[model samples]
Target: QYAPQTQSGRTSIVHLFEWRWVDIALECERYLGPKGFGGVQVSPPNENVVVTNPSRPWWERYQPVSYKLCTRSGNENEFRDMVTRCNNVGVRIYVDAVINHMCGSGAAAGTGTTCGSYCNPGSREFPAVPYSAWDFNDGKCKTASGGIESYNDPYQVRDCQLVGLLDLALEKDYVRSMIADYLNKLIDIGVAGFRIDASKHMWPGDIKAVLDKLHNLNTNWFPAGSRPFIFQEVIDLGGEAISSSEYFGNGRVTEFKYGAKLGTVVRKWSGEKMSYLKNWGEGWGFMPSDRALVFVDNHDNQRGHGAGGSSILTFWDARLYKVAVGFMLAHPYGFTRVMSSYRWARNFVNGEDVNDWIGPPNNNGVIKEVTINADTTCGNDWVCEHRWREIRNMVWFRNVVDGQPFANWWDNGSNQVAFGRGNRGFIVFNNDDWQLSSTLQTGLPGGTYCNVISGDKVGNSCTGIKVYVSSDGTAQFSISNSAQDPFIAIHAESKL
Candidate 1:
């Protein structure tokens, strides 16, 4: 379960939130497969209630109406085709599973669902799956509001409704089988794994039960008995009744502390400095490296909806954002994920982005197809951060240095830091108020290497900054704090 099952040297997954299936298929064939990305964390591909009052908000997908493979992303046919195509290219697909709950009780009355499946939240009935009031947790909830009201009580946190969303009675084998069958159906279509959503809201035992019912991955695309990789979204920042370790029996758990602290380190917030990151993972009390799924900013936190404080960086902070992402990729850490988002009209009246609920770029509920510009950027409002040269190059950087040890650490006792991924890769960062000039031992053989963060090794030469290593394995670094990007990096693949 810890294995990501990435093809050969690929190392990271990109969350293409709200992207259409056809577009993802094309990405695998033309970009992701060629660039060595591990896989994709796509939006939930299942039937959901349609919300028109606030328009087609993104949260609607989390509130499932049925297990049918039908949603605004695409229908069942299109989904199956995406699986076939991406798998054929060695680019795996990971489905986002929403098994924790269903539509909220406060959703406006609407006759149409993504798949036309009828679900009465008020009555606690969803005939599409034939789940009646008996399938919910109304009988077990002890809270006056019938929803989770206290984090100190683990029982209500796992069995009661979360924010009014109808909680599923996962303790029942019948409910477990229904969820298992839906996941197994995708396995048959060649999906590599799953990202279990709202994992903190359900019991780990119940989740294991559902996972036990799932069949092995399709032998056509995977090994004979390969278990689908599972990563649950368990946000444990301490002082909580339930800890992330309780859910590790299933698979990798998201380390909420990674982004929260990484953000402050780069922003220099709360006196955090790059010099303090020498001992990053377990030294900082994060989960074991093998059981953590790390990232800079996710969909929820980037929009201030999830964990991490305001210092957490997003694509909006493009300059520093890339720097943070660059450090994550170059360092030897847990599995990495990059976020690709769409532009939304932010209306911050009364200290909130009122338009945060807006859906993907669309016209009258029809999602627009992704369009490529001459510069290789995404049109139609898609902010494909994964395509940025600095980011895309780091994907390959991690692959080039796979299995290398983290060594040759050097810092200026302040915000300047440099380190080596064995002799395969070396990186430097300048997050201070002054210039950085030093002769650091990179632990690499003498050669001319391309600074991937600033440019690329086009043909036999570098198109941007170049780092020259001495025969003794030391490299000169002179990065100014005012420079556009205050970092320089080089890996074995870029050597000449």
Candidate 2:
């Protein structure tokens, strides 16, 4: 379940947050495949409620109306085509599945839906899925408010609704079969895996029951007996009765502390410094590297709706965000993921973004197309951080140095640090108040290498900057504190 099933040599996934199926299909062929990206964790693909009351905020996508594959992104036909095209180019597709709930009970009550399906959250009736009140945990919930009252209470956390959404009764055979069928349909269409949304809200055993019923991935794209990669979203950031480790039996779990702690370190909060991250992964109480899905920031936490509090980093803080993200990719840690998001205006009110509910870039009500600017970055408000020279080159750097070990560690006693992956790659960061100028061992043969973070290695030319290693494997380094990226990464692949 944990294997990503991507093409050999590719080593990372990108959460193309709120990207359209058609756009993803094009990207797979044009950029992702050519750039060595392993996969894309797309937004939820199933039919969901159209929250007209809130005028279609991004949150409604989680309020599923039915299993029908249709949404603002595209319909089933477009989804299947995207999967086929992505797989054809060796880029996998992992779906964001909202199997934990149907829809919300209060403000989300309605029959209006994306696929024109009939659903009544108030009545617990979704005729399109043919799900009735019997398939819900309404009777099993002991909480008076019918919603999760406390994270400390495991029973209430599992049996009760999240926020105002209806909790599914996966214990029932019928309910399990219905959910399995929806997932199986996606697998047959050529999906490589799933990001089980709100997995903590569903019982682990119940999750296995549904997973047990799933078919192997489509043979046209994957090998026979190839199980779909399953990564459950269990945001266990400590002090909760429900542990993220509990869901490990099913597949990999999201290691939220990876980002949370990285954010703190990047921001220098609680007396944290970049050099302290030399022992970053398991030494820091995070889940096993194999079972963790790590990222600098996600859709929820960036909006101040999920974990990390104010410590998280996002596109808004471009400079430091890249520093944090670069270290995550450079370090041999968990399964790394890059975040690609859209721009939204901020309306802060007393330490809260009152306009956090705003949706993606849209014209009238339709989501805007992802336009490519002249410089190759995304336009129309799509903050394609993945396309940034530093981030894009780092993605390839990770792939090139796969299976290498961390070595040649050097730190300036505080925010500045440098390290190498065996002899394949080396990276240095200048988070200090001054430039990082020192000769350090890079653990590579003497050669002139291109600084991938600053620019590309085009044919015989280093477009931006170059690094020269002496016969003794030492390189003179100088990175100003005020540099745009404040970091320099050079991999074996960029050696000229």
Highest-scoring model, lDDT: 1
lDDT of each: 0.91, 0.91
Predicted candidate 2 versus true structure: per-residue lDDT over 84-112, tens digit per residue:
99999999999998999888876445558
lDDT of 1 by residue, 150-198 (tens): 9899989998999899999999999999999999999988999999999
Model 1 pairs in collision: none
- Assess every candidate by TM-score: 0.99, 0.99
Model 2 misplaced stretches (Cα beyond 4 Å):
107-110
After best superposition, candidate 2 residue 199: deviation in angstroms?
1.2
Please report how far candidate 1 places residue 488 from its true position, in Å.
0.8
Superposition error at 375 for model 2 (Å): 0.7
In angstroms, the error of model 2 at 322 is 0.6
Q: Model 2: clashing residue pairs? A: none
Per-residue lDDT of 423 in model 1: 86
Model 1, TM vs. native = 0.99
